[PDB]
């Protein structure tokens, strides 16, 4: 009838797994600049945790990943439909917490940044389904919304409840959020490749396909993955060998270095201001 | 990337299919603009529900035409449904009333609990009772009607404030009637092992019927039933006396719906 | 037609390494019942054939690729041929009971095989439909499935036994029933401690009963049902859910109680006979201690 | 203190330089808590006649120092001391070995009582003694006494195990209980044997005197295999000359053992006390053997009584009968009922036929992957495969309850033989169906005489047995009729299923097509496609029909029916 | 134990099937202008028939077509591997057939034309497997080589075998053959579409995908075709409705009319510089 | 445009590591036949291209995901593109045989290719239908399938060979057939000692012939035929059956007997020259 045990089951499962906690560390780091009450910071951390959990729950069915952190995924314990149902309700649940922050403007930020996140994820899903390689500009504009969406969403809701005074620090913090969202995705791509199964594009894999327009081997191992469903170890070694010859990994290291210089410059400028 | 063509695609496709407009016809002296706003909210919520339900039932067709997940994929349809929820959120905001927000959130919570119970019963093959099944369809199906009626009463010019309870009861009875009718007009005209009022009566009145339970189990681990198996299921339901046990419910619900 | 293709699946399973629990049980009971070597060997053949047919059928109805580490009979001869050989083995055993020179041995056979088939039918119904039985229902079933061959052999031995030893029948039947319960709870314990076919057990029943709201265990069991077996990480999660409800200790308590009953019954039998039975107690030692 | 605490046991005090010219100044110890060792043999003896039977041999017991297991090895732990005396007495009496059947059951109760107590305390510690026990018993069995052997050097290593040294050795191992590595044993095996041989050779040497009398008593005895008696034929002498011969021969190689203790393990690595203590333990028993064997009754029996006198102080049936009633509710044709004596006997036979046919149909539907039967869903789609198999087996068991009420023992054998033939036929059918093997015409016709004519033969023979005595000369005629009738039914079924083989079943027309045309590759390819994919699509079926009709196989089939029909 | 019975086998089942005789009729067509003897005509016709049979046998495998002319395909009676083997041997058989024409240049012609045919087929396969939409120019270039290759082969060998005199009328005949193959392919596409199961790109489909690079529905249905290895009736009707809105069935009739104008002009021109 | 899709699979299979048995055999024959270097390189090109096409096709017709520890060609380019490239390779070699400046070099090519295709056809038919050939039938097949390239190369070399080389035609051809037979038996031995594609071999044919009633072996072979391959315990069971039947010793004796003929033929050829 009404027990609400089949709704929060999947939500509670994913919320009891090991996690890095980068989203909460970002809030803690920002709270130094914007002095805020512990109550508000904890509310924002809960919001970020719920949004992250919903995103993780959804992005596992769309990747057919049986395991998460060595533990089984949520849809392998509850079912795909139940996981979708709980994830679509976590959006409503967060909607009641943004409304408890006592600010009419906080709902506008929520409703705009969520739309940006959904646009980015929609583009990622399209490029995954239809194997169309995007340009570097396109890929860098997706991950500034798909991954930098949560950081920007948290930042804009925190400079609004920030006590008076500091209001000028809006553009700088937003740029920091975007650069961090870019860095945290290039880093994950580099880590995953140097140390693709679901035929997912990455920054190193676009450079290879762009610099080498006549590489017919790469474009065929990229299609065997789509057709069969995944690449075995012998084919993954071939893909890594093809990427090692185009200088894609060096390109990725250069991009990461360039991004980190921007991060440190923004941090030093912000520290100078405050 | 500032495009909306891969996010709004499935939403436009599901809104182009032919419909019956039950929710719109359901929709207190209200100004016309408010009525159009409420109709848009109802339509968008129904479209999202259909988009999600077609996936959770592996239905290749909807009203004769293809389903949304066979033209755009599963994941894109899911993303579009989530953004449709966000868009309904935006639409409720424009109604210019603080108290519509709480109504929307509470009704969505109830609708999701009902759908969760339905999904649990369908996946695990656990047969609900009469009371549990009749309480699940007061939320999964009557949730939209209750949501709309509570929203309409609030933004209606004063006077009509004591009729919230009566209209809510009317909405619950209406949702029950719709679900029981759709159960009836599906056997007196299953492949995903969906329970129903006739099926529950048959399985409860007969605690030792092994044939029906075996056919249902075959349906579960086959992806669906063929024509002979569906025919024997119908014969079992007809012999158990559940086609007119359901016809008594449809009359009893019509008695309540007529009174209030 | 020259035989073969019929007693080939039967001979493949008779050439595999075994243990000899039933044979040792017969030799342990013979010191109390006292039978000629001919009759004891005939009963050994009957028990061996019946156990082999049971294993042949169990492998098919469990989708088990291997048995004792070696390939199964139906992966070398086909499902249909194995079924045919198993059906013929029942007719073959029914030819050996007739050579025991007793009309009353046929009634015992035909009345205990019915109980065997009833217990196995309930096992199959619960496995296929996903229904979870109660502890009483589960314990009663394994008193007919696993403790039926022991009872069958026992009731045949107390009928060919020379005149006098015939009042010791109810005690021996109870001993066989408790042995059949013990041999199944032990396997249930051993498999878990060190579900691919959605098989129920004492720990799993306890976990499902004590926790009416554990939605994760009921979820992984359904995943197993809908995927033809669990993976190793899901198996570890199922096993971990069974150490938080106390199922592993509940199974050991049941095992201890069963062993106490076995020891009490053996002591009573060794007292109402006058002969200490040092071969059945070595079998008890080989089991747990 | 993890060393040998020899405070509970002490050496024997004797002023002589050495008794009987053996074991000069060796530690022949005696245990002060020896009272447990005494009953150990007596408790065993009480078990024997209670399980095996009466004894007339007294055994091993002397008024002097003590038992052979007492003097030789008193270095046991206080608790694990009497369990060994139980083993020794059985071994010291086993060499000599309806009521015969009862005697055997007694043996299984002695070879398990000793095993129980020994294994109970510690199995890995225990397993050593049984492992040595297994090979020890077997070795002496193989050596035939009628066949002789060669020089004493090759003799001793047979004898060192034949009477058996490692037996006492493995109990000493059982005394202190250190597990030893596998390969390190091998290099020290030639270290222990010189001690073992000298240890073992004494036993027989003292025991020679009593072994002699036995040969004269037994005529059939071929040889008294014994080391010292081997000198009697090899080096012919009076008698006591051979007793002198080895009196110091063993004495000569034990002196070697003192070196081995002080050698490399305890030499260069003198500060390696964990290993150096291990070596010493082995050489303690040696003085023990000569003590007891000196004058004991077992070896010198003159004491007899003097030794004895001095020493006297579920409701069920719903998941079983679920697939069976479903298949019995589907429409039938009444072919076997019409084929089938007072009315009750006829009804009993009709019930038997119906149940057997239902079981056959249930089993056959599973092995055809056929979802439908008479337009109605098959049984394995309402109850599954395993439940249907269970019900099919129980139906075979149940028919037996029906057969036994016909009041005829010679109806219990007809049923079994006919079912054997039915299963043979079905086995050949299944083998040909699976392993893509086309039978010949004769093989196919033989198979369908048993798979399909088995039921008719069974019913006819049962009816002849049941029927009044006068009309019993038919039998053969009716059986031949039934065989032809079943053949006709099978050929008809093959013919009709073609005019108007989704599982690649060999029919009568198909065999003709395959045999008359050895070079037809299209038909064979289509059959293999059916085997692999699972079945045939409609144009494939039409091309199969075209290939069969071109070869004139349907006209062949119709000729068989007219031939079969004429015989009927 | 030396019979050639499992090799020639698949090559006879495909020959037994009914045909339309386009290649034979074409061979008869250029024979009035070239006037070469009957035995040479029969040899050329046998070469063309064998090449067409090999092409059909390979094509049916590379598309999973259970049926051909209403009857089952060759790889459902002999399997895939034996069909591939027979297709590979039919090339060698055709090349034994060519040397009997008693002209060294026939071998060079044959080798060049088969190189072109294999290039065209390679591009067709790459576009089909990788889900890459060709442009109009690329598609028209491919169908000029894959489909017009056989006609060009036959006409180039015919103008070489034929009795002396007339030799300058080679380029015109090659142009005619290329245009004719283009027409055959476009006609086949139109007939199939009006009256992509294996994700095959056509002229109307290319036009629709080029005209509206925002139609996500068409692209999604084309991807569903690839994912499920085929399209059902409602999805095919939806694709046809999409093509009947972007003016793809009308942009195809103009191409066919232009190809007929070219064919008629080429025939007329090749009727003036002869007798 | 270009041939980037037609020569893809050919170049990929050329890149992979090889042994060089064909090139070594050509070099070995050269000491008797004394061809110029240019012709020897032309023949090496022909042999390499033919071998590569053969491997490309064999991997397809045997569902082998791997080749020498590296991914197969049809796992990178698809089955259709690989078949197309193999056919173009068959075409391309015929443009190389035509560059040897001898009309008679083409009839040899056509006849030996016919023989090779016949042998492979019998192999494929036996594999698909699950029919066990006889020893004579099996040995006649491999004398054409794997003894075909050797015979082709030998005949072309003797045809190009500068004058003389009269009697060195039949002896060298017999050497080629024996050598191909020995290579196939050696490969069968190696595969066995250190079945997934239901492939018959000398040990397996011997076992199924010496034992007319071994039902277990036939059942395991049918299970391999149906399921798609043998998992490890079933492969161990087949190996145990073969060891019990004595097939391994039969194979080793056959290998020794073939090597004796190889040695005698080589000694005789050296003796004549």
Contact status of F222 with chain D (Cβ, < 8 Å): yes
Measure the CA–CA gap between F128 and E10, rounded to whole angstroms: 15
Residues 6+ apart with CB under 8 A from B204: B127, B129, B130
- How far E8 CA lies from chain A's nearest CA (Å)? 34
The class (CATH top level) of C102-275 is mainly alpha
Burial class (CB in 10 A: 0-12, 13-18, 19+), A69: exposed
| D489-524 exposure pattern, b = at least 16 Cβ within 10 A, e = fewer | bbbbebbeebeebeebebbbbbbbbbeebeeebbbb
Helix (H, G, I), strand (E, B) or coil at B158: coil
| D211 annotated to a ligand binding site | yes
Sequence-ordered strand ranges (E) for F127-205:
none
Helix (H, G, I), strand (E, B) or coil at D483: helix
CA-nearest residue of chain C to D368? C80
Distance of CA A148 to the CA centre of its chain: 7
Instruction: Compute φ and ψ for F103, nearest 5 degrees.
Output: -65, -35
In the DSSP assignment, the letter for residue A162 is S
Distance of CA B102 to the CA centre of its chain: 22
Q: Could you tell me if residue D436 is left (phi over 0), alpha (psi between -120 and 50 degrees) or otherwise beta?
A: left
* DSSP line for D342-379: -HHHHHHHHHHHHHHHHHHHHHHHHTTT--EETTEEPG
CB contacts, 8 Å: A107 with chain B: 93
CATH fold of F1-101 = Farnesyl Diphosphate Synthase (1.10.600)
Residues E27 and E35 sit within 8 Å (Cβ to Cβ): no
Measure the CA–CA gap between D565 and A223, rounded to whole angstroms: 64
Q: Selecting from 1.10.600.10, 1.10.287.610, 3.30.470.20, 3.30.70.2860, what CATH number does the domain D9-310 have? A: 1.10.600.10
| F67 annotated to a ligand binding site | yes
Q: State whether B73 and E223 contact (CB < 8 Å).
A: yes
What are residue A72's DSSP bridge partners? A67
Residues 6+ apart with CB under 8 A from B223: B58, B191
Measure the CA–CA gap between A150 and F151, rounded to whole angstroms: 71
Residues 6+ apart with CB under 8 A from E273: E169
Contact status of F75 with chain A (Cβ, < 8 Å): yes
Instruction: Compute φ and ψ for C247, nearest 5 degrees.
Output: -65, -40
Measure the CA–CA gap between C208 and C217, rounded to whole angstroms: 8
Measure the CA–CA gap between D554 and D3, rounded to whole angstroms: 95
CA-nearest residue of chain B to E213? B5
Chains that touch D (3 or more CB pairs under 8 A): B, C, E, F
What are residue A67's DSSP bridge partners? A72
**Residues preceding discontinuities in chain B at C–N > 2.5 Å?**
27, 189
CB contacts, 8 Å: B6 with chain E: 216
Helix (H, G, I), strand (E, B) or coil at D382: coil
Residues B53 and B2 sit within 8 Å (Cβ to Cβ): no
Residues D159 and D204 sit within 8 Å (Cβ to Cβ): yes
Measure the CA–CA gap between D517 and D438, rounded to whole angstroms: 13
Helix (H, G, I), strand (E, B) or coil at C250: helix
Residues 6+ apart with CB under 8 A from D192: D169, D282
Instruction: Determine the straight-line distance between the first and last CA of chain A, rounded to whole angstroms.
Output: 55
Half-sphere exposure of E33 (CA within 13 A, CB side): 22
Q: State whether D319 and B210 contact (CB < 8 Å).
A: yes
Chains that touch F (3 or more CB pairs under 8 A): A, C, D, E
Residues B54 and B67 sit within 8 Å (Cβ to Cβ): yes
- Token pair, residue B39, equals 């109709």
What are residue D377's DSSP bridge partners? D372
Burial class (CB in 10 A: 0-12, 13-18, 19+), A100: exposed
In the DSSP assignment, the letter for residue F161 is S
Residues 6+ apart with CB under 8 A from C89: C10, C49, C50, C52, C53, C56
Measure the CA–CA gap between C142 and C129, rounded to whole angstroms: 18
- Token pair, residue B152, equals 């309409």
In the DSSP assignment, the letter for residue A99 is G
In the DSSP assignment, the letter for residue E166 is -
Which of B208, B213, B218 should we substitute to test contact with D (largest number of D Cβ atoms within 10 Å)? Answer: B218
Helix (H, G, I), strand (E, B) or coil at A234: helix
Q: State whether A224 and F5 contact (CB < 8 Å).
A: no
| C9-34 exposure pattern, b = at least 16 Cβ within 10 A, e = fewer | bbebbeeeeeeebbbebbbbbbbbbb
Residues D534 and D500 sit within 8 Å (Cβ to Cβ): no
CA dist E1 to A267, C185, D561, E32, F137, Å? Answer: 85, 64, 39, 47, 7
Measure the CA–CA gap between D184 and D175, rounded to whole angstroms: 20
Measure the CA–CA gap between A184 and A176, rounded to whole angstroms: 12
Helix (H, G, I), strand (E, B) or coil at C274: coil
Q: State whether F129 and D524 contact (CB < 8 Å).
A: yes
Measure the CA–CA gap between D367 and D199, rounded to whole angstroms: 71
CA dist E242 to C29, E189, E211, E212, E215, Å? Answer: 83, 16, 12, 11, 9
| C146 annotated to a ligand binding site | yes
Helix axes B98-124, C217-225, angle to 10 degrees: 50
Burial class (CB in 10 A: 0-12, 13-18, 19+), D402: middle
Contact status of B221 with chain C (Cβ, < 8 Å): yes
CA-nearest residue of chain F to E96? F110
Count Cβ atoms below 10 Å from residue F244 Cβ, excluding itself.
12
Nearest by Cα to D532 from F64, B222, F120, E76? E76
Measure the CA–CA gap between E13 and B35, rounded to whole angstroms: 71
Nearest by Cα to A14 from A125, A117, A81, A90? A90
Measure the CA–CA gap between C138 and C129, rounded to whole angstroms: 15
Residues C247 and C203 sit within 8 Å (Cβ to Cβ): yes
Residues C44 and C23 sit within 8 Å (Cβ to Cβ): yes
Number of helices (H), then strands (E), in chain A: 12, 2
Distance of CA C151 to the CA centre of its chain: 11
- Token pair, residue F147, equals 């003894």
Instruction: Determine the straight-line distance between the first and last CA of chain D, rounded to whole angstroms.
Output: 98
| HEC-encoded secondary structure of E183-230 | HHHHHHHHHHHHCCCCCCCCHHHHHHHHHCCCCHHHHHHHHHHHHHCC
Measure the CA–CA gap between F178 and F147, rounded to whole angstroms: 8
Nearest by Cα to F10 from F82, F97, F94, F117? F82
Measure the CA–CA gap between F217 and F207, rounded to whole angstroms: 9
Distance of CA F70 to the CA centre of its chain: 20
Instruction: Compute φ and ψ for D407, nearest 5 degrees.
Output: 55, 50
CATH fold of C7-101 = Farnesyl Diphosphate Synthase (1.10.600)
Nearest by Cα to B124 from B226, B254, B220? B220
CB contacts, 8 Å: E130 with chain A: 131, 219, 223
Contact status of E79 with chain D (Cβ, < 8 Å): yes
Contact status of E130 with chain A (Cβ, < 8 Å): yes
- How far F67 CA lies from chain A's nearest CA (Å)? 11
| D7-18 exposure pattern, b = at least 16 Cβ within 10 A, e = fewer | eebeeeeeeeee
Residues 6+ apart with CB under 8 A from B203: B127, B209, B212, B213
Residues F75 and A235 sit within 8 Å (Cβ to Cβ): yes
- Token pair, residue B161, equals 């404030």
Q: State whether C237 and A77 contact (CB < 8 Å).
A: yes
Return the H-helix or E-strand segment holding E67: strand E67-68
Measure the CA–CA gap between D76 and D177, rounded to whole angstroms: 10
CB contacts, 8 Å: A221 with chain F: 71, 75-76
Measure the CA–CA gap between D344 and C107, rounded to whole angstroms: 23
Architecture of domain A1-102: Orthogonal Bundle (1.10)
* Calculated CA dihedral for residues C86, C88, C94, C98, nearest 10 degrees: -140
| Structure determination method | cryo-EM
Residues B18 and B62 sit within 8 Å (Cβ to Cβ): no
CB contacts, 8 Å: E1 with chain F: 136-137, 140
Measure the CA–CA gap between A145 and A120, rounded to whole angstroms: 5
* DSSP line for D74-97: ----SSTTHHHHHHHHHHHHHTT-
Place of tokens 């804009």: A156
Residues A176 and A263 sit within 8 Å (Cβ to Cβ): yes
In the DSSP assignment, the letter for residue C16 is S
| HEC-encoded secondary structure of D139-201 | HHHHCCCCCCCCCHHHHHHHHHHHHHCHHHHHHHHHHHCCCCCHHHHHHHHHHHHHHHHHHHH
Measure the CA–CA gap between C37 and F47, rounded to whole angstroms: 75
CATH 1.10.600.10-classified regions of chain C: 7-101, 102-275
Measure the CA–CA gap between A185 and A196, rounded to whole angstroms: 14
* Calculated CA dihedral for residues F200, F205, F207, F208, nearest 10 degrees: 90
**Residues preceding discontinuities in chain F at C–N > 2.5 Å?**
194
Measure the CA–CA gap between A261 and A271, rounded to whole angstroms: 15
Measure the CA–CA gap between D307 and D310, rounded to whole angstroms: 5
Q: State whether B5 and E216 contact (CB < 8 Å).
A: yes
Helix (H, G, I), strand (E, B) or coil at F23: helix
Measure the CA–CA gap between C34 and F195, rounded to whole angstroms: 54
Q: State whether F122 and E6 contact (CB < 8 Å).
A: yes
Whether D and A touch (3+ CB pairs < 8 Å), yes or no: no
Residues 6+ apart with CB under 8 A from B126: B120
Helix (H, G, I), strand (E, B) or coil at B66: strand
Nearest by Cα to C106 from E33, D405, D463, D446? D405
* DSSP line for D32-89: TTTHHHHHHHHHHHHHHHHHS-------S--SSS--HHHHS-----SSTTHHHHHHHH
CA-nearest residue of chain C to A12? C216
CA dist B256 to C131, C229, F126, Å? Answer: 38, 49, 76
Half-sphere exposure of F116 (CA within 13 A, CB side): 23
Measure the CA–CA gap between D211 and D225, rounded to whole angstroms: 10
- Token pair, residue B229, equals 């198996």
| B63 annotated to a ligand binding site | yes
Measure the CA–CA gap between A98 and F72, rounded to whole angstroms: 55
Radius of gyration of chain B (CA): 20
Residues B200 and B133 sit within 8 Å (Cβ to Cβ): yes
| HEC-encoded secondary structure of C164-214 | CCCCCCHHHHHHHHHHHHHHHHHHHHHHHHCCCCCCCCHHHHHHHHHCCCC
Measure the CA–CA gap between C252 and C214, rounded to whole angstroms: 23
Return the H-helix or E-strand segment holding C66: strand C66-67
Nearest by Cα to C198 from C145, C247, C235, C144? C235
**Residues preceding discontinuities in chain A at C–N > 2.5 Å?**
195
Instruction: Determine the straight-line distance between the first and last CA of chain C, rounded to whole angstroms.
Output: 52
Measure the CA–CA gap between D455 and D356, rounded to whole angstroms: 8
Burial class (CB in 10 A: 0-12, 13-18, 19+), B224: middle
Nearest by Cα to C27 from D472, E230, D108? D108
Nearest by Cα to E181 from E125, E107, E262? E262
In the DSSP assignment, the letter for residue C29 is H
CB contacts, 8 Å: D320 with chain C: 117-118, 121
| C231 annotated to a ligand binding site | no
Helix (H, G, I), strand (E, B) or coil at C70: strand
Vertex D291, ends D286 and D296: CA angle to 5°? 135
Residues 6+ apart with CB under 8 A from E94: E47, E50, E51, E54, E110
Domain E11-102: assigned CATH number: 1.10.600.10
Residues 6+ apart with CB under 8 A from C103: none
Residues 6+ apart with CB under 8 A from F75: A221, A224, A235, F65
* DSSP line for D509-560: HHHHHHHH-TT-HHHHHHHHHHHHHSS--HHHHHHHHHHHHHTTHHHHHHHH
Residues F164 and F139 sit within 8 Å (Cβ to Cβ): no
Return the H-helix or E-strand segment holding E20: none
Which of E130, E198, E217 should we substitute to test contact with A (largest number of A Cβ atoms within 10 Å)? Answer: E130
Q: State whether B214 and D382 contact (CB < 8 Å).
A: yes
What are residue D30's DSSP bridge partners? D10
Place of tokens 């089984």: A72
Nearest by Cα to B145 from B45, B51, B52, B253? B45
Residues F166 and F203 sit within 8 Å (Cβ to Cβ): no
- The total number of residues shown for chain B amounts to 260
| A189-205 exposure pattern, b = at least 16 Cβ within 10 A, e = fewer | bbeebeebeebebbbbb
Nearest by Cα to A77 from A149, A11, A156, A155? A11
- The total number of residues shown for chain A amounts to 274
Count Cβ atoms below 10 Å from residue F216 Cβ, excluding itself.
20
């Amino acid at each position: 009838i009404l027990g609400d045990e089949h709704l929060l089951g999947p939500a509670e499962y994913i919320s009891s797994l090991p996690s890095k906690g980068v989203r909460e560390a970002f809030i803690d780091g920002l709270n130094v600049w914007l002095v805020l009450p512990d109550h508000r910071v904890n509310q924002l951390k809960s919001i970020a945790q719920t949004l992250h959990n919903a995103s993780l729950m959804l992005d596992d069915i769309e990747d057919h990943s049986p395991l998460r952190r060595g533990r089984p995924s949520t849809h392998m314990i509850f079912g795909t439909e139940q996981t979708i149902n709980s994830a679509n309700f976590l959006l409503i649940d967060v909607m009641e917490k943004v409304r408890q922050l006592d600010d009419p403007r906080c709902m506008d930020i929520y409703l705009e940044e969520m739309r940006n996140l959904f646009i980015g994820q929609s583009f990622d899903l399209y490029w995954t389904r239809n194997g169309e390689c995007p340009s570097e500009e396109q890929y860098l504009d997706m991950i500034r919304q798909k991954t930098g969406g949560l950081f920007r969403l948290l930042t804009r809701m925190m400079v609004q409840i920030a006590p008076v005074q500091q209001k000028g620090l809006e553009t700088q913090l937003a740029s920091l959020s975007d650069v961090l969202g870019e860095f945290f995705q290039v880093r994950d791509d580099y880590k995953n490749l140097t140390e693709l199964d679901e035929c997912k594009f990455s920054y190193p894999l676009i450079h290879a396909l762009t610099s080498q327009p006549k590489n017919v081997q790469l474009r065929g191992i990229l299609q065997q993955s789509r057709s069969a469903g995944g690449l075995d170890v012998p084919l993954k070694e071939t893909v890594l060998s093809h990427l090692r010859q185009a200088g894609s990994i060096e390109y990725t290291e250069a991009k990461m270095g360039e991004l980190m210089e921007k991060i440190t410059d923004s941090v030093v400028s912000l520290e100078g201001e405050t």
